[PDB]
Amino acid sequence: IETVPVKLKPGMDGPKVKQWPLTEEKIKALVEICTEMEKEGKISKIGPENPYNTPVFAIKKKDSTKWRKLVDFRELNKRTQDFWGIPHPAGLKKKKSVTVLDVGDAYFSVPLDEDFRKYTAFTIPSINNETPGIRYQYNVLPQGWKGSPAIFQSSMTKILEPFKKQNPDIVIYQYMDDLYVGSDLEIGQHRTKIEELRQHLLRWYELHPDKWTVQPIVLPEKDSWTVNDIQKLVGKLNWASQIYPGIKVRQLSKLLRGTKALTEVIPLTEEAELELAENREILKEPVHGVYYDPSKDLIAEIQKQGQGQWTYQIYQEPFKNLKTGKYARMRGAHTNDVKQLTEAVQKITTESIVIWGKTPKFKLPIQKETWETWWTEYWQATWIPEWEFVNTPPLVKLWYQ
Amino acid sequence: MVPISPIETVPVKLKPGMDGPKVKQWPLTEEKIKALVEICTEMEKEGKISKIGPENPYNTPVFAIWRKLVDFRELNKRTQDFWEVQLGIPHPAGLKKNKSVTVLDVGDAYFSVPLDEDFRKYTAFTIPSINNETPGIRYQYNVLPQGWKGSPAIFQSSMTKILEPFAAQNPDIVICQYMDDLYVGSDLEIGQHRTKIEELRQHLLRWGLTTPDKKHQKEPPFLWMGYELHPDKWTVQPIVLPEKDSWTVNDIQKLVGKLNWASQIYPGIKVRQLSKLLRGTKALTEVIPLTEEAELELAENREILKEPVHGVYYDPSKDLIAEIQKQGQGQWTYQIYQEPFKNLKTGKYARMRGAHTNDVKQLTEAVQKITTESIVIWGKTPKFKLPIQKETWETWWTEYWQATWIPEWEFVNTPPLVKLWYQLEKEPIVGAETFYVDGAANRETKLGKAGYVTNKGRQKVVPLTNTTNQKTELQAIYLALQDSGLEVNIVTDSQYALGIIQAQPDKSESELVNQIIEQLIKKEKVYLAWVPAHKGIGGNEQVDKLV
Numbered sequence: 001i002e003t004v005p006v007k008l009k010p011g012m013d014g015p016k017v018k019q020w021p022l023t024e025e026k027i028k029a030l031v032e033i034c035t036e037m038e039k040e041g042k043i044s045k046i047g048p049e050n051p052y053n054t055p056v057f058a059i060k061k062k063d064s065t066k067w068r069k070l071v072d073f074r075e076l077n078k079r080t081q082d083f084w085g086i087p088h089p090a091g092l093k094k095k096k097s098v099t100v101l102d103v104g105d106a107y108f109s110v111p112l113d114e115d116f117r118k119y120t121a122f123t124i125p126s127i128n129n130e131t132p133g134i135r136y137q138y139n140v141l142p143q144g145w146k147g148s149p150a151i152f153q154s155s156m157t158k159i160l161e162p163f164k165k166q167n168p169d170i171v172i173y174q175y176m177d178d179l180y181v182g183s184d185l186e187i188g189q190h191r192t193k194i195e196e197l198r199q200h201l202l203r204w205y206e207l208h209p210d211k212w213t214v215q216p217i218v219l220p221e222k223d224s225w226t227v228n229d230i231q232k233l234v235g236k237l238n239w240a241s242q243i244y245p246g247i248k249v250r251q252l253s254k255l256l257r258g259t260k261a262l263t264e265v266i267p268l269t270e271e272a273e274l275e276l277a278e279n280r281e282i283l284k285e286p287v288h289g290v291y292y293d294p295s296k297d298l299i300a301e302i303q304k305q306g307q308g309q310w311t312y313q314i315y316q317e318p319f320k321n322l323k324t325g326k327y328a329r330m331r332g333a334h335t336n337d338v339k340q341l342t343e344a345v346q347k348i349t350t351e352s353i354v355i356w357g358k359t360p361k362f363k364l365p366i367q368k369e370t371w372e373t374w375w376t377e378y379w380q381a382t383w384i385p386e387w388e389f390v391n392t393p394p395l396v397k398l399w400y401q
Numbered sequence: 402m403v404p405i406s407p408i409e410t411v412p413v414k415l416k417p418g419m420d421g422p423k424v425k426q427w428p429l430t431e432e433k434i435k436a437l438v439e440i441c442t443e444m445e446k447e448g449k450i451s452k453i454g455p456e457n458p459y460n461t462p463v464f465a466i467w468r469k470l471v472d473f474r475e476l477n478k479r480t481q482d483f484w485e486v487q488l489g490i491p492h493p494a495g496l497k498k499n500k501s502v503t504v505l506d507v508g509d510a511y512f513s514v515p516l517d518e519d520f521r522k523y524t525a526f527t528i529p530s531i532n533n534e535t536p537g538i539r540y541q542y543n544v545l546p547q548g549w550k551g552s553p554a555i556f557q558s559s560m561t562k563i564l565e566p567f568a569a570q571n572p573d574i575v576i577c578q579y580m581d582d583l584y585v586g587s588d589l590e591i592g593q594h595r596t597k598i599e600e601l602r603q604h605l606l607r608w609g610l611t612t613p614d615k616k617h618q619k620e621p622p623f624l625w626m627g628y629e630l631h632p633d634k635w636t637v638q639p640i641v642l643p644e645k646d647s648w649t650v651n652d653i654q655k656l657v658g659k660l661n662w663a664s665q666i667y668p669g670i671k672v673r674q675l676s677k678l679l680r681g682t683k684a685l686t687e688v689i690p691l692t693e694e695a696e697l698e699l700a701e702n703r704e705i706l707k708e709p710v711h712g713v714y715y716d717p718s719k720d721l722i723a724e725i726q727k728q729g730q731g732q733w734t735y736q737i738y739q740e741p742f743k744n745l746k747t748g749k750y751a752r753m754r755g756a757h758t759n760d761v762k763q764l765t766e767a768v769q770k771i772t773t774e775s776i777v778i779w780g781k782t783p784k785f786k787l788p789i790q791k792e793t794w795e796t797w798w799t800e801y802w803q804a805t806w807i808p809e810w811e812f813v814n815t816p817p818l819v820k821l822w823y824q825l826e827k828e829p830i831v832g833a834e835t836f837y838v839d840g841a842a843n844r845e846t847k848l849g850k851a852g853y854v855t856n857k858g859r860q861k862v863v864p865l866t867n868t869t870n871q872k873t874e875l876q877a878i879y880l881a882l883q884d885s886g887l888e889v890n891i892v893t894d895s896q897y898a899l900g901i902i903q904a905q906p907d908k909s910e911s912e913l914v915n916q917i918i919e920q921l922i923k924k925e926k927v928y929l930a931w932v933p934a935h936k937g938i939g940g941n942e943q944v945d946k947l948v
């Protein structure tokens with residue numbers, strides 16, 4: 001009911017990002033949505049004196065046919081002054097179950113600071129560049145802007161005070177337009193509790209982090225090793241020796257002495273078996289000196305393993321993985337590589353939000369033009385992370401398979 | 402007098418930390434001074450400007466051709482940024498055919514849009530007095546001045562706000578704003594069309610804006626931005642390729658510009674050889690000889706451009722189709738149409754700069770470019786016709802290390818067909834000879850060696866001059882491919898060569914890579930295995946090539 005002064009970082013102008021082309025159905029969807037929002041005072045039309053711009057597009061959330069407006073506030077978010085903070089709940093990832101709730105509509109009940117509104121300008125584009133577009137700016141807290149949860153944090157505490165006082169065993173975290181509610185109850189009790197919380201918030205996505213663990217390096221167990229098997233084993237062990245100090249391969253490389261056929265079976269010597277067993281014992285221990293630094297970026301790498309399988313690693317320093325995983329879920333994307341990759345990016349970003357409270361920087365195994373052409377067609381999350389593109393095939397792919 | 406509705410002014414500011422312009426007035430001739438006095442007196446009588454006192458410290462120079470020309474370059478440098486009047490040039494192939502298209506001159510409205518009151522003082526200018534014996538006449542603008550930075554955007558936005566209710570209450574017509582001209586198309590009867598034109602003239606008169614009653618100057622065919630727009634078709638303005646005994650740099654730039662421009666409706670235009678002659682050229686005036694490939698390409702272009710070709714307008718009730726053909730040397734051409742033999746438009750795509758490539762990646766990139774262009778022009782993705790078999794594409798994207806996707810498409814049997822030229826094995830080949838390859842080079846003398854040892858005792862080492870480590874690794878793999886049967890296992894330690902081959906190129910800048918590719922095409926089965934170097938892996942002979 002009262003505006004809080006908001007400004008940009010010193011020396012930084014507002015965002016001026018080009019609006020990318022949109023299909024006719026997404027444009028019409030945005031026209032209906034923005035007309036309804038304008039009737040409700042959430043946005044207002046602006047004139048040519050506003051030069052700023054932030055891209056917009058339209059998505060369709062899970063289990064819903066209604067279109068939803070999504071603003072790409074990434075540039076404005078990095079250009080908006082830092083707000084202050086709350087330490088991340090380290091126990092949210094330790095909980096048995098977590099549920100994600102979209103509490104974005106609440107932001108629309110708080111007006112936005114006057115002099116800042118012009119920085120939230122966006123454009124509904126016209127087909128074939130016939131008009132300069134329909135230009136709007138926000139009057140209330142916009143969804144997707146980092147200032148919205150920071151400004152609404154007091155009101156959110158006031159609304160969640162009775163529920164948090166009633167259930168001290170439930171962890172509640174907020175990131176952007178999402179509310180993560182973790183507990184240890186049964187699935188039915190968790191769903192009834194989620195309906196209880198949503199009806200509690202009404203007056204004024206199953207996720208199980210306990211079923212997720214870090215993936216160790218594993219070596220084959222065979223009774224007959226071919227030359228090729230041993231060569232791949234030595235390659236994988238040499239790669240792992242960058243992560244684990246005492247990895248040893250010389251006894252196994254002794255067996256490769258001579259110019260032998262790749263498919264020829266080689267019996268393991270006793271020294272080779274002992275070396276392989278020592279390597280197994282070394283690989284069962286965690287990596288030495290692995291810590292998280294809140295001042296550094298998180299980096300997520302993804303490898304396509306084929307047959308709908310994808311591997312990923314999250315680290316800050318090379319060979320110091322903070323998280324590893326293997327997303328192989330099949331959900332209406334069996335014939336579309338890009339949709340699978342986009343879903344993997346969304347799941348990895350969610351996991352990163354739960355663990356560290358921020359989004360990682362992705363390295364995507366895809367050409368820039370393909371990704372940038374198609375990723376908005378399968379995006380369903382409120383937030384958007386950063387990404388770069390890998391054009392050279394990494395050799396370590398099969399070592400994560 | 403009928404009351405005139407006021408036009409809401411746009412608030413304008415200067416760039417932060419900057420002040421208004423203060424440019425000294427050039428001395429003018431007595432004749433030019435008299436002309437500017439007459440013109441400015443008439444404009445003041447009309448209300449475009451007003452006289453101001455000496456307390457205004459700002460000034461902008463004024464010139465005569467008479468006609469008044471105020472040079473607002475300094476004020477433009479000091480004026481805030483505005484939203485663009487256009488985010489792109491419309492393309493004729495996106496226009497929807499109308500039974501009638503009328504043109505209205507709203508130029509007189511340009512001087513009827515008021516300027517922000519607090520900003521008018523920055524537009525001050527001074528007419529020099531005769532013999533400079535009296536103070537010059539001080540004026541300032543009350544409306545959007547011609548040449549000022551914000552005039553086109555404020556004018557277009559004001560006109561848009563004015564037209565919005567008329568366009569909303571008449572959805573059966575189309576109104577487009579372009580500069581000081583309005584274009585009104587409709588499928589109504591000619592009488593109803595002219596009627597709604599009169600209604601538009603009345604609605605504009607509600608703001609005091611005057612539309613010329615006498616017949617206009619623009620009429621089919623419309624000449625606009627290098628285009629001809631006809632009632633039922635569109636094309637580019639006539640493209641004529643000049644006959645030249647010798648070609649300079651600007652002649653080749655004019656020629657490649659004409660061919661690029663013509664390629665949007667004339668199918669099959671190629672510009673690779675002619676653009677290749679402009680490689681690394683710094684002089685606009687230098688003369689460059691024509692290669693024979695440039696002559697053959699130019700002749701093919703002259704044969705394509707011999708007679709006019711037209712594109713059709715867009716019909717949203719029909720499907721959108723885009724067909725692609727490979728032309729060679731990284732060139733691709735495409736046609737976008739809704740009915741067979743009636744193209745909406747055409748185009749081309751050249752491969753990007755790179756050391757290695759293949760036809761499938763290039764076809765993919767062309768598909769993405771056409772997808773984006775089609776979303777721009779028509780707001781939807783076309784159905785594609787591609788010269789590649791369904792099984793080829795499936796093998797490719799199922800086995801490719803990157804994620805890749807092409808939207809809905811169908812195979813069209815138009816050679817040359819895009820195909821996979823080799824596929825490496827997933828497992829070692831039983832019964833096939835195993836070649837352990839290695840190469841090495843001296844960083845100083847550039848002397849190297851490349852070779853192999855096999856499980857059958859076959860061996861080879863070749864000495865090389867003027868080479869590098871990477872070159873010797875590739876050369877070693879090439880030697881293994883040359884001397885092996887139709888099925889071969891190959892063991893290397895070169896992460897470089899594996900990074901190249903796993904990218905699956907079919908053409909390269911390196912002749913060595915191309916030779917390796919030809920050998921791979923000749924083979925039946927090739928398994929390529931990698932091992933770490935200097936790890937005592939027998940067979941992997943680093944010492945044999947370091948002698």
Ligand SMILES: *CC(=O)N(C)c1cc(Oc2ccccc2OCCn2ccc(=O)[nH]c2=O)c(C)c2cc(C#N)ccc12
Pocket residue numbers: 130491496497498499500501502575576577578579584585586587619621623624625630631632633714
């Ligand atoms: C307004 C605009 O942005 N442009 C590029 C433009 C469009 C024109 O065509 C037009 C205007 C309004 C409604 C419909 C159409 O065109 C539909 C197809 N069509 C074209 C020509 C014709 O005779 N009949 C048709 O059905 C025109 C004509 C322009 C002309 C000029 C000029 N000079 C500039 C811009 C446009």
